Design a protein around this ligand. Structure first.
Ligand code: CA
Ligand code: CA
Ligand code: CA
Ligand code: CA
Ligand code: CA
Ligand code: CA
Ligand code: CA
Ligand code: CA
Lengths: 352, 144, 352, 144, 352, 352, 144, 144
């Protein structure tokens, strides 16, 4: 149980330099095996890079089959995944489904293609699909998905107006250019699909130059469209790029980790004390020292204490903000004003 | 729900003690001091600001019934208690030590009576190397 | 009146998944009908995609005519649009004018072209113009227009200097290249309009490569212009992109909704009490307990109370800021300093 | 406007009560306490900071006349009152309930006398299912 | 003197709609006259657009000569420019030098070319140079120059590393490609200047496609260079674009204009009172009620009061900041702690 | 020793205008010598620009050899570099290794090539490598490396997903286009390396247009890939550009330099007083006025005072933040509440 | 500068009044109260924080001499006073009214003695329509 | 480390003085006042917040042993003291004057006894033009 958690921390949540050496070695062997998948299509190298890719794929199907079995066994140190239904819960998460598909399709291709051209056609796509293996616990995809979801209203706005300008401008250039002839003798903008391929290439600033408008009406519309409606496709890089940079700035004003230890302890035990109220024989009533009406009013006060503790645990996990300054000045000024009332009442009591 | 609102009007009358229909911080403070609790003024204000939705500073009766309606066995509240245990969790596997949980429950935050913690520990299977699965607690105290 | 508001919330302010299923189905049928408007220009498919576009347009003119009539009737649940002049107010807003133009021009084209080539030329532009129908209540255009208006001084600055660099640099490359001959035998930069089309294509980083400068003077000017004056056209994506991201960050420090309920109530009733002052027989004078000079001074104090309540209602709608901390410390320190003055005066009263 | 500035100098003299030409927070506090109002010190300071434009903290006479000049029947002020009603509006259609408006006007914020609210309700057509069009109120109290 | 300031506000600091109508009309006539400068180079239109450009330039040299004389006279409402040396100060500012050069070179060209081809060659550049006239008081150039100067360390960093990657990568592609032949039979990368023109076109993402590397070594170096070192030329749009957006955000937390009126009054009169100290016969000494040693200590205290008033006037012009909260809490807590000391001392005085 | 520090400040940490004139003159002579390295490859100028580059390199190897010797001697004013091992420490820093390599390889090439074509091949790369000399103390590279390191999680995220979209999309376009023929008769996408060169050129928005997909399946995949996966390569300019702009904004809210002088003095002398504790004969014990148990408790209190002084010195170097407001309100409210307790206790002492 | 530092050591001794070499807020407060000024505690603290550069809170003698060294006739200080007049300037042309300047100098901020303002006005050419060129003042009071 | 934890339990008992196992701000304040120190309340709170890791506000014994475990001779702590000397360093070469260091150590911050500074100066080679290499001090007081 100790060594089980030790190898789970080596494979699944890696840290240090020994974990870095292992995962860098795995990333290099899958990238070298992709380079041989590139060289298998060049006619000079197609004989060599197939005879060294059939043997390299047998080593990697044994290696990643062994690593998947070790990782599936070693996922039992977590309390989520212990038991047979817990292992089936570990095989349900999406990176393990990708890893299982890669290893079992490699066995199918190497057993069917052992005794072959379409087997190579199936190898090359698995060589590509094995690149998803290096990002281990999905932190890359969760960081991107978090920033795309917060900024979803702005990304839908710029994609909608950019698409809308694409459709209207490609139609106006199709009308202005549908009779023009190229210098080679052919017709550039034959259909409306050709002008729409022009519009996609122009609005994203690629400009292959295979389709260029010829008449001065098409050049005038393309000049106004290219000046204005290109910014609506360069905006998602600006929105997400500044969204990442503001999130990194906000991570430096974090609260220190000890400031949530009393709030987390208080959340656990106010929630338990709300649970222990519904048993009338519990020893949780012995704090409040017969008890007919007091059962109900203790349950109301305990529910209020749970809601306050839940709010203060949520506030102890956020970064510092102006809301914290206004909240603690409200508490401090209220305690101090009550204290001057106490001094006032005692001065009026004794002297009068 | 008519027996429920009968009980909730019954419980609201123990705090009101006149015909206002509102609960003041003083009007709650006398009830807590009659139980021998002695809360602070900002504690009473923090209790009442989590109940009202009108901002005026007192708890009317529909606000009281909205507090008693909403359920502890929640989608979010289960995740808050599960996230609260993970602060006290070394290596994050889903197990905390027995004497570590007794040290946390009797010292940090609101300090618990030692008989309560002796009940809290024996609610879960504590043996097996001294480890306890705190998700058994989270399912237990959100079974309601 | 109940079902009228229920279908207005279904069509006009949609939310949930049932509303999402309806508007996604409408967006798919208008996009599929656009794809057949694309295929009607390809010579292989021009016979098929016209015989299935005349029938698809009759279904959609009946469908969107019915939806416009239902939406126009169901706009009467709002108090703005009730009555015949209210319905005419609902037909004046710009998205309903677009929807009316689409449905009535579809009826005109399908009745004129029923008994046809220029009818197809009129169908295709309405197929495009029907894409404005999916963004229902204009939240896309209002979000873009809000950020463009706040940043108007910076967008005019970068567009002006980018245009100014375009004009000067295209003239200098026209002077350096007006005698050069291409390798094909023709002359690239014949007029100053050709060099200005070169400048538009270069400064927005498209680069079709149809017009490239040949001499080394034109290549030197194009190198300095392309390094510096391209950033002045990549700046509106940077200004608006960071403007959207700072607005999204500011939306997370909103005040909670209950903190403006007493301020909104206080604005309504201080404004009414200012209104009820000008009737001398009103029962609003009975708070202030004969009344010759007191009429004027009550009206002054009530006008001051209205101005204070209007300020505090504007402050309850903004996010938290450093101005709030300075304002509540000024109020708290002033109350506490008056309280120490009160204790001081009573101590000097009794003892001396 | 000469009869207007005669009335405005007349009204300014009731606050000044000497030959200063300025109004202090004390000098306004005695007028409000003579009407039986009892305002707080920060209330008087909030009243005076909405009138002056010199920052010194007292209301001179051109500042007083600038306050009395500018009009309640405004482009912006109509929209502020219309936006203030929409907080209390469920489904946002432009109608609020009669008993909901009576509950808001007599409890929240500055609490109104019940005879005032009985006047305020009957200023508008209240029947028709109990709904009241609050834009009739906004046109009414900005008709001035 | 009244009408002089009225026309200076119309021409020099414009606002409203009447000022907008005037300056929009001037911008349209200078842009229409630029369009005829474009059409004078097309061979079809060179006869028409010269015979209507000689007459259009006489109207505009009379019009802008009259406007320059009116503006130079009407600059005397300012106190800076009153007097003959003040008018010469008004003709020294850079936008007036541009306006004077345009009008006097138009007179020289229209008088020399009246009785002509090189005159047209001189007209076209003045048609372009007259575009600087629309931005009147230089707010466009001062806004850009302010943001470029604050971010100067970052712009020099990205321009230096982008230039450095340009030089090294263009040399390595020159070595890999200096013997390759195009499919047309010619040699693309003949010299190192050809590979450096390739590098400029690639690193700014234009890509004309006239020069593309052929060998696989040149394609490998161009792939790594184009992935990494292109971001160092897309960074000045990112730095300046987010610099403009943060400046616009900071303009909404401005202090209100009345909060600097007592600080500006206090700066003026503490500075005057420091000036009035050095005359021993002044009436400024009569506040401090013989006077041998007190002359020096009053001058020290008055110099300290001037420095405090200058600091508080600088602080009243900045937006709100966390420094303001810490500063006013220091002042408030110090006054309140002294007040509790005062109550303590009087309680120990009377009772003991 | 005085003149040694004076020339070290002239060469190594330059400031003013005299230092600017010197380093601008050095940057111009190394750039002019690079321009002659460009002209030595053009066939018209290869005879001239070699006969003036052999003599220009002898002047520059004498000049930069002399400057390196002067700078190495003059580095002894610092206390880090005094002594022979200190000079060897000065020759270990990376900009001095670059400068030594340039001058000694220039001597090797000019002595071997004195009595020559491959010598010119070695001169040109040193002409390029001498451009690293202008950025003197590495502030350019340290500013870039600081912002790249803070934003490392986001840059690895966008580079990983951009590379992953590159590989999958280039494979799908290779499948759709591997049989298509160009209009010239050749085959564009012959191997998978050709489609991967297409993908690199497209995803970074260069678009040379040498390789354009022909079939409609390749055009459909290229349209979806070019709309979406191009933003993942325009994101590192957005992340770093907004990272630089937020860092510049944070530099304006710096604490003033006098607010860390008492904290730096307190750190030095609490750390020394912790050091002086372990000698029992020291005079540091004489503050605490026999001493058996008091030795241990003084060492505990002195260690606590050192940790507090180290925290307050770290806080005096950061900009202002909301954490400072919450920290000083906690200190101020705690002192003031203790003071009201003191007044309460004395009032209950005397009167009761 | 030896006569200057003789005068500056002479002036420093009037504040010190013992052999400390430092000036405390109390030690400056007694000098200002001996002139009949009555400053606040935060006023004395604001005076001393503009002089020291060590942060300790007292004015040593090199800090005192650094204050007396630096010149009022400055590049920046002229622009601060010129920017301070433009707040009170309508239409921004460089002229303010005579009675407007008398109203500002005798009411706002530190209130001036009326004989001082009667001197201040006649230092500049006041006639010509009642306008006064305030840049004549800025050149005057920065001529030092 | 058993002799070390014997000494650390011995030193912890001098602060505890009962069987709590925790140290309060009062419980530390009596020890410092018995040495004749007179600290402020916020000084005692700043001392204790640098030791605990539980946030409760008292120093338990494992927190006390964690404070006594971690080493002054550190990678970071050497750089903090080296950065603290550079504030008082003109031209930044690595040398400060002897009388400048005596002026800083006896006036700024916690004021040192003059006999301590006379020891501190003679710990380093002070001659050679009056300059002293402060990195010799940093190596000295981090030799521990
Ligand atoms: Ca009540
Ligand atoms: Ca309430
Ligand atoms: Ca008065
Ligand atoms: Ca005023
Ligand atoms: Ca002294
Ligand atoms: Ca000092
Ligand atoms: Ca204890
Ligand atoms: Ca603790």
């Amino acid at each position: 149980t100790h060594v089980q958690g030790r190898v789970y921390n080596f494979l699944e949540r890696p840290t240090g330099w020994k974990c870095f050496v292992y995962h860098f070695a795995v990333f290099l062997i899958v990238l070298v095996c992709l380079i041989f998948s590139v060289l298998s299509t060049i006619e000079q190298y197609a004989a060599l890079a197939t005879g060294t890719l059939f043997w390299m794929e047998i080593v990697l199907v044994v290696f990643f089959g062994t690593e998947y079995v070790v990782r599936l066994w070693s996922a039992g140190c977590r309390s989520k995944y212990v038991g047979l239904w817990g292992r089936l819960r570990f095989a349900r998460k999406p990176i393990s489904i990708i890893d299982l598909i890669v290893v079992v399709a490699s066995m199918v291709v190497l057993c069917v293609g052992s005794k072959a051209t379409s087997a190579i056609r199936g190898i090359r796509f698995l060589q590509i699909l094995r690149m998803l293996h290096v990002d281990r616990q999905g932190g890359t995809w969760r960081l991107l998905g978090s920033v795309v979801f917060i900024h979803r209203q702005e990304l839908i706005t710029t994609l909608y107006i950019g698409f809308l300008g694409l459709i209207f401008s490609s139609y106006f250039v199709y009308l202005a250019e549908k009779d023009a002839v190229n210098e080679s003798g052919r017709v550039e903008f034959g259909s409306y699909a050709d002008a729409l391929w022009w519009g996609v290439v122009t609005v994203t600033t690629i400009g292959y130059g295979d389709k260029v408008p010829q008449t001065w009406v098409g050049k005038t519309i393309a000049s106004c469209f290219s000046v204005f409606a290109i910014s609506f496709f360069a905006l998602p890089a600006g929105i997400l790029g500044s969204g990442f940079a503001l999130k990194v700035q906000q991570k430096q004003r974090q609260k220190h980790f000890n400031r949530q230890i009393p709030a987390a302890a208080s959340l656990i035990q106010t929630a338990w004390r709300c649970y222990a109220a519904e048993n009338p024989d519990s020893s949780t009533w012995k704090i409040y020292i017969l008890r007919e009406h007091h059962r109900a009013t203790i349950k109301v006060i305990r529910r209020m204490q749970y809601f306050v503790a839940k709010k203060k645990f949520q506030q102890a996990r956020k970064p510092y903000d102006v809301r914290d300054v206004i909240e603690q000045y409200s508490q401090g000024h209220l305690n101090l004003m009550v204290r001057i009332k106490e001094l006032q009442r005692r001065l009026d009591q004794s002297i009068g | 729900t008519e027996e429920q609102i009968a009980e909730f009007k019954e419980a609201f009358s123990l705090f009101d003690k006149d015909g206002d229909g509102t609960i003041t911080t003083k009007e709650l403070g006398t009830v807590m001091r009659s139980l021998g609790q002695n809360p602070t003024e900002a504690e009473l204000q923090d209790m009442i600001n989590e109940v009202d939705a009108d901002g005026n500073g007192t708890i009317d009766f529909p606000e009281f019934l909205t507090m008693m309606a909403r359920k502890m066995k929640d989608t979010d509240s289960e995740e808050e208690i599960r996230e609260a245990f993970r602060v006290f969790d070394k290596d994050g596997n889903g197990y905390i030590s027995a004497a570590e949980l007794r040290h946390v429950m009797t010292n940090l935050g609101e300090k618990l009576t030692d008989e309560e913690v002796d009940e809290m520990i024996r609610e879960a299977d504590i043996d097996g190397d001294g480890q306890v699965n705190y998700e058994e607690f989270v399912q237990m105290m959100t079974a309601k």
